[PDB]
Amino acid sequence: PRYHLTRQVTLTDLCQPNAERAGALLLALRHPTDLPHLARHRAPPGRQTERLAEAWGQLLEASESGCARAGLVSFNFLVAACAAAYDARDAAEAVRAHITTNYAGARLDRFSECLRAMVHTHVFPHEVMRFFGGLVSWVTQDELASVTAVCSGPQEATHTGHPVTIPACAFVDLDAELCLGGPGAAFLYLVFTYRQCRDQELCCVYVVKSQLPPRGLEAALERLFGRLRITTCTYAAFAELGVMPDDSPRCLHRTERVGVPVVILEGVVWRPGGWRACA
Amino acid sequence: CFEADIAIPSGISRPDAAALQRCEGRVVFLPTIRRQLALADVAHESFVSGGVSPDTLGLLLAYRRRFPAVITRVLPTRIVACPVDLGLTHAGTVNLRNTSPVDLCNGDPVSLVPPVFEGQATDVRLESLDLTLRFPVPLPTPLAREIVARLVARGIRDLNPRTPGELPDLNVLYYNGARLSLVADVQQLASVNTELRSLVLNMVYSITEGTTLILTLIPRLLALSAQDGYVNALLQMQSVTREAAQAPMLMQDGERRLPLYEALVAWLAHAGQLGDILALAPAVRVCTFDGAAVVQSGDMAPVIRYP
Amino acid sequence: CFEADIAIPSGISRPDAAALQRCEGRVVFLPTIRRQLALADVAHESFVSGGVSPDTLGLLLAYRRRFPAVITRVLPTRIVACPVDLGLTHAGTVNLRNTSPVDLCNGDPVSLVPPVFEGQATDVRLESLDLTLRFPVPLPTPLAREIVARLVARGIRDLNPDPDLNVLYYNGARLSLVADVQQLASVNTELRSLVLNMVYSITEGTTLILTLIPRLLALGYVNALLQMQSVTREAAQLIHPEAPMLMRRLPLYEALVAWLAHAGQLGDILALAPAVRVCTFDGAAVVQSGDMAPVIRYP
Amino acid sequence: WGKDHQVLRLSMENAVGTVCHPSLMNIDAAVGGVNHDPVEAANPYGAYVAAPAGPGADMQQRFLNAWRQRLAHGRVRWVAECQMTAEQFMQPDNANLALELHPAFDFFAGVADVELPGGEVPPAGPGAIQATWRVVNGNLPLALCPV
Amino acid sequence: YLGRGAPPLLDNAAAVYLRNAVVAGNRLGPAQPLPVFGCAQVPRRAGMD
Amino acid sequence: SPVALYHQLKTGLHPGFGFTVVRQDRFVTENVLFSERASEAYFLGQLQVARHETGGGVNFTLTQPRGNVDLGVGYTAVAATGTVRNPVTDMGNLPQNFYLGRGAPPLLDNAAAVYLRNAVVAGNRLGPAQPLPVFGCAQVPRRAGMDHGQDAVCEFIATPVATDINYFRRPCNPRGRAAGGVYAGDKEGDVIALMYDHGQSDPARPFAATANPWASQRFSYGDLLYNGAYHLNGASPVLSPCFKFFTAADITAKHRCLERLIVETGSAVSTATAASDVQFKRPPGCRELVEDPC
Amino acid sequence: DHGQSDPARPFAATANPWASQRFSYGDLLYNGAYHLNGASPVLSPCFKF
Amino acid sequence: MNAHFANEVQYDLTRDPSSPASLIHVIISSECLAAAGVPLSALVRANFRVETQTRAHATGDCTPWRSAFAAYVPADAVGAILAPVIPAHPDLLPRVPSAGGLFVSLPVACDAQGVYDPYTVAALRLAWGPWATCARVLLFSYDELVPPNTRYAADGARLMRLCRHFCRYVARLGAAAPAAATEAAAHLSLGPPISPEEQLTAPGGDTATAEDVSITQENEEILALVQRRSLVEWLDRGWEALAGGDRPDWLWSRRSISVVLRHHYGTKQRFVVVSYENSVAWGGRRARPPRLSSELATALTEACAAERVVRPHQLSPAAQTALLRRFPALEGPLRHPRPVLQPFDIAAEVAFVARIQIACLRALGHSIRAALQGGPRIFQRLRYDFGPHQSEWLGEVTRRFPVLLENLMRALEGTAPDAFFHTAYALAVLAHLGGQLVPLSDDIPARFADSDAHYAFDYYSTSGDTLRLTNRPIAVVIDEQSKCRFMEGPHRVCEQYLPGESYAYLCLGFNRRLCGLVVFPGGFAFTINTAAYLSLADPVARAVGLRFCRGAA
């Protein structure tokens, strides 16, 4: 009812929202203790399915689940772990200087191996680490966590807009699509662009910028790419991060919390959307 | 609603102000999200591209990259439109006008189709503001998916001639009775070609490795034909399935991948999505509060969200 | 919200009254949205479409057709349900009853057929007025799309016989799909019509495309770009399938619409779109079978 | 003077960003827009190239007799050696005023359609108005560059 | 042929010969024929007296 | 060649001809408005707004309708102009860059033009870095400091050297011939006739026809650069001073009834912007309310 | 449209093929789109039909 | 690059066709186009359509026009395959420049167990636009096109220079190379510019080398008695780090490349014969064993070279039929009474054309005499009124008249026949020989085939020199009297007027009926029955039309 609260109790083995900002684009970790099984399934047999059986098992080594399940993944944890992967180096790598000095690359180094191992056996990182929200409160303990980081529509950026102002956490991120500029409202999405066996199972996390519908986004997902050179398949999944109902309030900064480039985005209808991955 | 207005820009033909009154509940394709916008991008002259007007398959592609909007209230100064793509958050269920020869149902998903009918052109003309208006025809979605397959395949017959001139017209439609004839006047090629390619390229990926085992059971299909009712009615007479009847190819690597289960996945990925990648997305659903089971031609039906 | 009332009919027993006490928080389907309704619009006997009992196809036609309603508070002489499909997005928190998987903190659960699980579980019958309330199963979007394609794949090996498809691990648990002793023999006769639908839409199109594309490209931007992204994929499928199978334009393009007409049916039939969301507050983020969950309105 | 008690300087090295664009050689619409409403036969002595024919020994007595006719007909396009400056700027006495358009080019009444390295006597008749190219700066006429 | 529960003929040459021999013009005759999901679509004529 | 003319000027040598400079200073002034007693109407209305509740209340605006007519049949209540505060955009040396926008077929010798690409746009204050994408502006860079004011644009038009200096000792038309829609006599064809038809003489300087035939005639080098129909610039947001002079439609688009002519001079909309470091051509959403006698 | 039957008699398309069809001999004579008759005073009674 | 590759996707078609085929990559350079009559500026203005058809030498028909591909790139066209250009790294391989042109691979007619037929011509056509003026035709025989073997020996020096230039690029640039590129350099060191023209001019080619192993095994044996992952896999990461992608265009620049020089029998020119390793085209090392056989190029030569028979119609009667007992497709060029194509000549396709140039001029020249037998009465046919002193202009036209009709026919002789087929009379006959089919370049409007009143003109200069003043056939619809009317519709001067409207114009129109007009200024015109003088034999004309018609869709 244009104001909501959500809560999930996890560890600070992940994000450590005390080390994060007030505004962070948190993911969950849905199906957290999953993927020894789907490592074996869903892949053609030339992928040697005994890789992710150890790969996530080295992740929680860096992080026993207990009663506080592994979850609440930060926005930082994918950018810096793919910083060595995608086509931005020493600028996306400034996100690694943000994490390891505030959060830890010990958990990144196990997970950057997962980002070459999850995508290896066709266990693609979309529909795992589902969207949760914008880190409203951080009522966490010392080594444990209790975060309210509301999902559920536009109210996350009104109740942090009548007061976290939604950073993009990298100037390389918030992909400035539509340089063909005009007035309107912004429509935000979460795309994982892949490269399968060309760049050896590439991982990518960035947000697009468009005044485009979901039907005007799929052909926009076929155009503007140079990573078509694959053949397996089902690359470039995306869901709706929702509407920023203003293109006027975007910004360009390098000040956060290590000087990391960052984009202020004030006022967002967080339509949670749905994923799609077929081609 | 997240209110969006379109003003009356310049002058009025005095009966044509009443023509804007009887368009309450229709749909405007405005290619933006504005707090105010001129009426110039509204009409079909904006639908016309550089030099050339779209065909009824190009208008599908023209209605692709624009935004539908519902006429809510009609002022002599403005027209308040509600942005369907975002502002469908209406427990008041903002109302639409059915301009269609089909009496629908209760509970139909409703998708929008350009005017292609033989007698429901929806042509209203403004001469003070020199503009032409084609309103889309809201229709039920299986009947909508029965139309778009006809018009592309009619343009598939625009590539190759070969056959004698007596072709099956693709111009007789069937809803419980109700013989419908549509318009076949012009078929622009690029609207056919780009629609044909995605019909090709999606049907490429919808075949996989474990898909091939299913092809063995094609003679198994006709074994059910002469021994039941359901199968024999399922098997169409104008089908290639009755024509193709007149094998593992071992290559077995590993055999723990579930090859038959993986076949139905990627087939559904692309051949399962063939109505919506060719046509417009349905977001309008029939929902009347009074318990009325159908909605008459010309009525004001209440409209709820995405199906 | 806009709470809608379903009228309790005449004389029921106390176990029929207690049957109404074991359903507080289930999912109910209804044809129209009249503010007063009766129980005659609710029962499984109200799902007859051709004079016989519906199958899992005949339910999933209606399960995508009519409207979900969730009973908040049970009553004598009435049934209060605050329906899902009315109201603005992410408002009007409602409460569900879990069935054997988790329903995690997210997942966007989907109503679907009973006989994909135990058939005479959740087929709760009223004894006095003699009607049957077969409540749908609320499964979340990944596993709901998973199990729907497995039994119809298991229907193939049950169709014309000569691995085992039924293990299907969850994140933690091992989900026993097979309820062997009396259900699986009823499975392959209650998904009976449905397997023919997944087959005939494959046998038609693949045997149509292999006489479409050779009839195309020479009858040119779509020509060379046909196998451009399909190099050694479609020509390899032309090498594999067209050899170990058999090989007309005016019936062909007549069959073009008809298959793709059946294709547009199945997309509305299959894939089980999300209707309601779990995104709770101050919970343990993990729901168990038989426990309530705060469930919010729109995906 | 600037917006002070301050001096400023404008060179012709100032003119680097304007004269050096590749639009100085962009005269497509010019030849097209002047082409309609044609010009008559302007007895094209200097507006036509002949390919050579025979030895050079008699080549005069070819061209002496070949242009015996359309040489005493009228005048050539240049008469401006007699014209002082701003006599070109005035509306009389320069019918070729509407033919001076580009600093880097020339519009003059030449032959119509016969390809140039060929023939001796061009078919006097309708005329054409095309281009040549001004090569060096001295080709500007002497009412625009004083002696 | 409005219904479909009956197991049909096994020979296809008799199957869609006897099917369209009756259905061909009936006032109750299923045109654009029986979907797996959907309705039989009874032909509504233009005027009824 | 344009390549040779790049190569003559940096050395310094007069390349056969000359130029002319058209630029735009801007001056903030304190005007004086006399009025007659009873001139306007200015009525009043009613005050209430309960608008959309935005969180913790809408907070209750109350707007009021009004309206006003010119209650007077003549030129009531007019105007003056007396002081010069400060010259907002500077008297400046800043040249014009034509490589700012895409307008022309390049050289076919592509080795040559890419040499001349950065040769011109080495370090202009109006020279972009990371040059033109398909759609969008050139993004003129920002210098670290600005002192005197907004920057000028010194656009150049080729002139023969052999004109009078007597012309340009007058407020004259820089194209070399009178062009505005004042002088025409309402015969429906004389407007373009004084513009391009050089059979007649100049309305301004009638003993001759033009002053620069390279700037005057149709399809001349002056006319090829800054015509609004050709639109060489249009990607580059740098305001042409010469756009105002060289437009076949816009001077012809004006009326000539004198009553409406002078009052538009009291409030015209410029093509310039007093909210930008250079003369950025006017953004389509803003007003300026200039005077502009030119 | 003889694909649909007669509303008066649903068990038949028409009762006459020679006049009731489009471009049939009845419509050739008596429809006013051709006006084979009429520059003439005598009222055709069948003009209304 | 890819135009050689995408035509192989059209070679991935055919399946089981009428005749099994091959494909030869042929790189025409600049002066072979320039000396042909191809304006190099207009194709420089990369995928481009080429209409191709193939023609037998002896007898028979031709192929219809096949839409092919092209890549016209001004560069070192040999050096661009050998030293390609990464967008970030254009100095990955510095080279020596060369000439350049269009990249077009061309298919080859073969047999079952293919023995290719020399002297038989595949005909190119570049279409700048629609018009026949925007068209040229090129000639290529298989003697010109097919070498016996390639020269992949030149590919041996190239590939190890590639590994040294990956050893050269990282050492110069240093740490600016990314993490995948700093590895694959030194993995090529543990294993001068590249001039691409030396791969043509160094005398080395292919050899079976089995005779060159036994000639070396019995050569190193005496020496012995007296004494008594690869580098190519590191080339992929060499490209995948410097480019960032796969690029199947560059994938065959790493594999075996033979670059063979040949020459053109029409204009003394040179061109290039190319075969990769992975090409399904000819000379590829992934192809179908039944390819070509150089047997006809050795049979009819040596049976005429050992017998010293200079022309094989002077071949001995047993020496004729014994070759016919060997190769049976030669009954055409040896035992046909009057083949419409000349047997055993180089210009047999050219002499096929020049007859048509001759036979129409006699059909012209004896028809001009026909309507002008004696003193004529022509009075007029159009409506053009005079001023009073304008009649004295026609006082010249009395005196001027008879010198024209020689010089028209002199100019009809004076044109090349290759330049005659772009004019109106050479296509109006094709509009009539298709009526005894749509002729080429589609210069014929949609309404020329409607009436006989739709004529189609050419325009010649009356005064000065008698020269043609058109590119376009200007089709003017003509109604005692009849006034003129145009049809419906890069800028040519004379194309604005009515026929015979003004002085200094001769107007000359023709029909599908092939009853033509000769229109003079002043209405003074007359029909000519050239249909009474066109003597074109249909079996002669049926090889004419099929090479000059286009099957309209």
Author numbering:
A (entry chain S): 106 to 168, 176 to 215, 220 to 279, 286 to 353, 416 to 441, 445 to 466
B (entry chain O): 5 to 165, 168 to 252, 258 to 318
C (entry chain K): 5 to 166, 174 to 230, 235 to 262, 267 to 318
D (entry chain I): 443 to 589
E (entry chain F): 1130 to 1178
F (entry chain I): 1032 to 1325
G (entry chain E): 1228 to 1276
H (entry chain k): 1 to 45, 54 to 199, 230 to 266, 355 to 562, 569 to 611, 618 to 627, 633 to 696
Please, what does the article write about this entry?
Here we show asymmetric reconstructions of herpes simplex virus 2 (HSV-2) B- (containing scaffold proteins inside, putative capsid assembly intermediate), C- (DNA-filled capsid, derived from the enveloped virion by using detergent treatment to remove viral membrane proteins and outer tegument proteins) and virion-capsids (enveloped intact virion) at 8.1, 9.0 and 10.2 Å respectively. The asymmetric reconstructions reveal a unique portal vertex in the context of the icosahedral capsid, including 1 portal, 11 pentons, 3 types of hexons (P, peripentonal; E, edge; C, center) with the hexameric rings formed by VP26s, 320 triplexes (Ta-Tf) and 12 pentagram-shaped capsid vertex specific component (CVSC) densities (composed of a UL17 monomer, a UL25 dimer and a UL36 dimer, presence in C- and virion-capsids). The portal vertex of the capsid is a hub for protein-protein interactions that are important for capsid assembly and genome packaging.
Despite distinct organizations of the CVSC at the portal and penton vertices, the packaged dsDNA is visible in the C- and virion-capsids. In contrast to B-capsid, small tail-like density, previously named Portal Vertex Associated Tegument (PVAT), extends outwards from the portal vertex in the C- and virion-capsids, suggesting a possible role in genome retention and release. Lying on the portal head, a novel five-fold symmetrical assembly comprising five copies of a well-resolved two-helix coiled coil (presumably being the fragment from the portal or pUL36) shows close contacts with PV-Ta.
